[PDB]
Scaffold this active site. Structure first.
Site, PDB file in Angstrom:
ATOM      1  N   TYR A   1      36.037 -98.127 -64.526  1.00  0.00           N
ATOM      2  CA  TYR A   1      36.057 -97.996 -62.933  1.00  0.00           C
ATOM      3  C   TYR A   1      37.339 -98.519 -62.157  1.00  0.00           C
ATOM      4  O   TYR A   1      37.312 -99.186 -61.047  1.00  0.00           O
ATOM      5  CB  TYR A   1      34.940 -98.819 -62.265  1.00  0.00           C
ATOM      6  CG  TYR A   1      33.592 -98.666 -62.897  1.00  0.00           C
ATOM      7  CD1 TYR A   1      32.776 -97.614 -62.554  1.00  0.00           C
ATOM      8  CD2 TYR A   1      33.161 -99.539 -63.860  1.00  0.00           C
ATOM      9  CE1 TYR A   1      31.534 -97.433 -63.139  1.00  0.00           C
ATOM     10  CE2 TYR A   1      31.924 -99.357 -64.445  1.00  0.00           C
ATOM     11  CZ  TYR A   1      31.106 -98.316 -64.075  1.00  0.00           C
ATOM     12  OH  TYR A   1      29.864 -98.178 -64.670  1.00  0.00           O
TER      13      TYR A   1
ATOM     14  N   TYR B   1      20.945 -90.306 -62.781  1.00  0.00           N
ATOM     15  CA  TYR B   1      22.124 -90.381 -63.680  1.00  0.00           C
ATOM     16  C   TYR B   1      21.802 -90.194 -65.148  1.00  0.00           C
ATOM     17  O   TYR B   1      20.895 -90.856 -65.629  1.00  0.00           O
ATOM     18  CB  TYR B   1      22.878 -91.730 -63.569  1.00  0.00           C
ATOM     19  CG  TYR B   1      24.115 -91.831 -64.489  1.00  0.00           C
ATOM     20  CD1 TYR B   1      25.343 -91.286 -64.123  1.00  0.00           C
ATOM     21  CD2 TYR B   1      24.036 -92.517 -65.717  1.00  0.00           C
ATOM     22  CE1 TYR B   1      26.466 -91.405 -64.954  1.00  0.00           C
ATOM     23  CE2 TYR B   1      25.145 -92.645 -66.551  1.00  0.00           C
ATOM     24  CZ  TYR B   1      26.351 -92.085 -66.167  1.00  0.00           C
ATOM     25  OH  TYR B   1      27.471 -92.194 -67.004  1.00  0.00           O
TER      26      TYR B   1
ATOM     27  N   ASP C   1      14.737 -89.496 -69.697  1.00  0.00           N
ATOM     28  CA  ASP C   1      15.907 -90.193 -70.173  1.00  0.00           C
ATOM     29  C   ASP C   1      15.632 -91.693 -70.139  1.00  0.00           C
ATOM     30  O   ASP C   1      15.679 -92.314 -69.083  1.00  0.00           O
ATOM     31  CB  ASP C   1      17.102 -89.884 -69.288  1.00  0.00           C
ATOM     32  CG  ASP C   1      18.382 -90.526 -69.776  1.00  0.00           C
ATOM     33  OD1 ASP C   1      18.281 -91.386 -70.707  1.00  0.00           O
ATOM     34  OD2 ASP C   1      19.436 -90.219 -69.147  1.00  0.00           O
TER      35      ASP C   1
ATOM     36  N   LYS D   1      21.496 -97.359 -76.023  1.00  0.00           N
ATOM     37  CA  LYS D   1      21.770 -98.676 -75.438  1.00  0.00           C
ATOM     38  C   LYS D   1      21.107 -99.786 -76.251  1.00  0.00           C
ATOM     39  O   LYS D   1      21.653-100.218 -77.344  1.00  0.00           O
ATOM     40  CB  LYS D   1      21.501 -98.698 -73.935  1.00  0.00           C
ATOM     41  CG  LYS D   1      22.571 -97.944 -73.130  1.00  0.00           C
ATOM     42  CD  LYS D   1      22.373 -98.230 -71.624  1.00  0.00           C
ATOM     43  CE  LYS D   1      23.500 -97.706 -70.828  1.00  0.00           C
ATOM     44  NZ  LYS D   1      23.425 -96.306 -70.353  1.00  0.00           N
TER      45      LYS D   1
HETATM   46  C1  LIG Z   1      24.071 -95.215 -70.088  1.00  0.00           C
HETATM   47  C2  LIG Z   1      23.162 -94.038 -69.860  1.00  0.00           C
HETATM   48  C3  LIG Z   1      23.506 -92.698 -70.346  1.00  0.00           C
HETATM   49  C4  LIG Z   1      24.850 -92.556 -71.030  1.00  0.00           C
HETATM   50  O1  LIG Z   1      24.967 -93.172 -72.309  1.00  0.00           O
HETATM   51  P1  LIG Z   1      26.531 -93.386 -72.641  1.00  0.00           P
HETATM   52  O2  LIG Z   1      26.333 -94.136 -73.847  1.00  0.00           O
HETATM   53  O3  LIG Z   1      27.350 -94.039 -71.596  1.00  0.00           O
HETATM   54  O4  LIG Z   1      27.202 -91.953 -72.963  1.00  0.00           O
HETATM   55  C5  LIG Z   1      22.624 -91.670 -70.124  1.00  0.00           C
HETATM   56  N1  LIG Z   1      21.493 -91.861 -69.427  1.00  0.00           N
HETATM   57  C6  LIG Z   1      21.057 -93.036 -68.902  1.00  0.00           C
HETATM   58  C7  LIG Z   1      19.749 -93.206 -68.207  1.00  0.00           C
HETATM   59  C8  LIG Z   1      21.895 -94.211 -69.155  1.00  0.00           C
HETATM   60  O5  LIG Z   1      21.621 -95.365 -68.684  1.00  0.00           O
END
Ligand SMILES: *Cc1c(COP(=O)(O)O)cnc(C)c1O
Ligand SMILES: *Cc1c(COP(=O)(O)O)cnc(C)c1O
Lengths: 418, 420
Positions: A20, A148, A236, A265
């Site tokens: 950023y 997102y 997601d 993550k």
């Molecule tokens: C972080 C995140 C992504 C992206 O994963 P990256 O490892 O940065 O490519 C997709 N969806 C959600 C909800 C996230 O928090």
């Protein structure tokens, strides 16, 4: 009563992009030497509680002995082998573990190199599914206005090619939907379902989009609509997965299962990039029995055994914690410690859910000022826009969490002086 | 008689690349790996002729790669790159700028090759917007390229998937001179389209997943001149070619050109883990940074991962320690000598070797179930695609190991063709 000035690594400042900031950035990056427990440690020896868990992922903290040992055990066998025509025990053992814990009905697993790739694969699966189902008009996606899902080009398109949007869900985890809200969503499906392969959403917590919490009733309604109108529900769970909302998977708040789920993550305890896309058997079979039986994606490092092995260890840790109790206790402490922030004129509100706390300010955070308050108060937090939020690790003690929240409230108060 | 291990959970529940679920043929369970070998659950060692898809250039279980991994784990496997940096990122960056083509000066670390490509395309678009040439919003490539499987990369690979522009595949043959007609056609494409083009993306010298095609450095020299004269950024995708594969450290070196943007990956970490980078000139970094949109609008969560950086340092140090040109020239010579007799087999079209790549191109698509039944008994692992039976062995392979691999491969191909 202080300001701390960090020393610039000239090479970083001139040559390395960071997520950023421009190049060079206006303010230099802090060089981190090592980490341990909940702490990151600067090149000069200063320990900082990482309130962010390295962007949601480092849920067991840093330099965890079990995670390290699991990585090293796998390393001695092989760090990596290709997944074309070959498989390995970490992939199998991780897959069994995942199917034992994820929402019912998810049965097929596509391992991915990152969350954004997992999302790209989810969208591809949905498109191929509809083509196999002889509904080729179902070629678009929908989401809510505040989402997102990653930074790759297809994921970008459902982040707030053309897609379709509905209202952001109403703010408030405990808030009941109104009849008008129910009818509007229903109407959206009546109108558009023949165009929609899938509806994608972050369940319960919308993260990078504004750290918004919404009712499980919304997800329950969405599941029913997707069922009745033949639209795949894609959840997601890359940020929410493995405990963050106060349940192992945020879908559990609604007692629903998605057709497709993405995870990442916290999957590896934040040690390394890795993700997965899970689907129902109906999706896997329908594609597999179609004219296009192969799912048309395949990252070079798909299924990486080292990532699989650390993920097994991470899941075992999460399961060992009593994740609902752990996160309930985190929420209670963060709420108690941070609620007094609302006393400050420049604070809008404070909202906590599970292992997430957000202090929303009236005006955008001036980052250098805020940060030059960081070091002297022993903590690391990374605001975005008007949001000063923490997502601490599940291993944090009550005393450590209290220290972090007291420090944060002192930083916010001192910041609102300038 | 060899019995290999398979797994019913894998077969029913785990997708593999570009595969159905279940697959028609089961996956072989690998327990461990060492040197050039992968080792099945039952103890069978196989020479991996593929280097795990181009990447495991130092072989498996390398003690110096392992040491780098262990050393970084003791400090931190990962920390976020937002507002923070670390010594592995710095040290890797210094190593990279010392070796890559001249002019590359800014480095964006990425999670995978596909994401590196996505970031390259975004850099080029943001650059043209900053340069006040917003009509330059599309990309070109040759027919026969490959740049990753994410949606934007898919679009330059040979309504909802965006339209781009294509020229002929470059002529086959590393030593082949361009014709006047070929020069004119490429030139005409630039005259016609350059005002629409932010960049031209290409794999230098070797086009991989698109057909294992080798082409002349003259082509890359012409493309560089056209991109210079017509204000189109040249994006060289060195994810597969980087770190020695074509017989030079970077394939751009064959042409003695530098791209505006370069992607690397694969061999970067010795194939231990996913990681990649996108490099640009200073002009691109500055122009964006000084624009109305100064921030490059990408940021994967695991950007700059210190563990990956640390193993990449070790991998580059190894490559630099080799005489990479001499090692790959010797590999080429051996593979050419050993595999040339394949051309005498009915249903082989041709054999072509360049640096540390060898290709036996067949007349008809490889029937993979038949082919699979010949691997194990001949002690090798090779993964055909389309009509291509190709190898990309590691740089550590000995003369005798490489001879063994090539003699086995020729035995497999011969038995496959008569069964087919
Ligand atoms: C972080 C995140 C992504 C992206 O994963 P990256 O490892 O940065 O490519 C997709 N969806 C959600 C909800 C996230 O928090
Ligand atoms: C492998 C490859 C990529 C893709 O890298 P992934 O790691 O699979 O995303 C991109 N470009 C080229 C030339 C490659 O060979």
């Amino acid at each position: 009563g202080h300001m701390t000035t960090v020393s610039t690594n000239d090479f970083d400042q001139q040559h390395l992009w960071h997520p950023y900031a421009s190049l060079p950035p206006t303010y230099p990056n802090i060089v981190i030497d090592r980490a341990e427990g909940i702490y990151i440690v600067t090149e000069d020896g200063t320990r900082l509680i990482d309130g962010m868990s390295s962007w949601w992922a480092s849920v067991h903290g840093y330099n965890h002995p079990k995670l390290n040992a699991a990585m090293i055990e796998q390393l001695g066998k092989m760090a990596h082998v290709m997944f074309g025509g070959l498989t390995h025990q970490p992939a199998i053992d991780l897959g069994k573990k995942l199917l034992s814990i994820v929402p019912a009905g998810l049965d097929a697993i596509f391992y991915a190199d990152s969350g954004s790739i997992a999302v790209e694969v989810a969208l591809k699966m949905a498109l191929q599914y509809q083509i196999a189902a002889k509904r080729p008009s179902k070629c678009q996606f929908a989401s809510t206005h505040s989402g997102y899902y990653g930074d790759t080009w297809h994921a970008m398109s459902v982040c707030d090619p053309m897609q379709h949007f509905v209202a952001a869900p109403p703010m408030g985890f405990e808030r009941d939907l109104t009849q008008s809200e129910r009818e509007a969503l229903t109407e959206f499906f009546v109108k558009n379902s023949d165009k929609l392969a899938g509806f994608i959403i972050e369940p319960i917590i919308q993260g990078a989009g504004g750290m918004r919490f919404y009712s499980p009733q919304y997800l329950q309604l969405l599941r029913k609509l997707c069922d009745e109108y033949d639209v795949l529900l894609i959840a997601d769970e890359i940020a929410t997965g493995f405990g963050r909302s106060g349940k192992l998977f945020a879908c559990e708040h609604a007692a629903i299962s998605p057709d497709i789920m993405t995870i990442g993550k916290a999957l590896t305890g934040g040690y390394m990039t890795f993700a997965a896309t899970l689907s129902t058997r109906e999706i896997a079979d329908t594609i597999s029995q179609s004219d296009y039986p192969a799912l048309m994606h395949g990252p070079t490092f798909m299924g990486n055994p080292l990532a699989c092995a650390v993920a097994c260890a991470s899941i075992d840790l999460i399961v060992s914690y009593d994740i609902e109790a752990r996160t309930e206790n985190m929420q209670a402490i963060m709420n108690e410690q941070l609620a007094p922030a609302v006393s400050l004129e420049g604070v809008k509100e404070v909202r906590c859910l599970g292992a997430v706390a957000v202090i929303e300010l009236n005006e955008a955070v001036d980052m250098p000022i805020f940060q030059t308050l960081l070091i002297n108060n022993g903590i690391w937090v990374r605001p975005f826009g008007k949001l000063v939020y923490i997502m601490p690790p599940y291993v944090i003690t009550d005393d450590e969490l209290t220290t972090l929240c007291q420090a944060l409230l002192k930083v916010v108060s001192s910041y609102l002086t300038r």
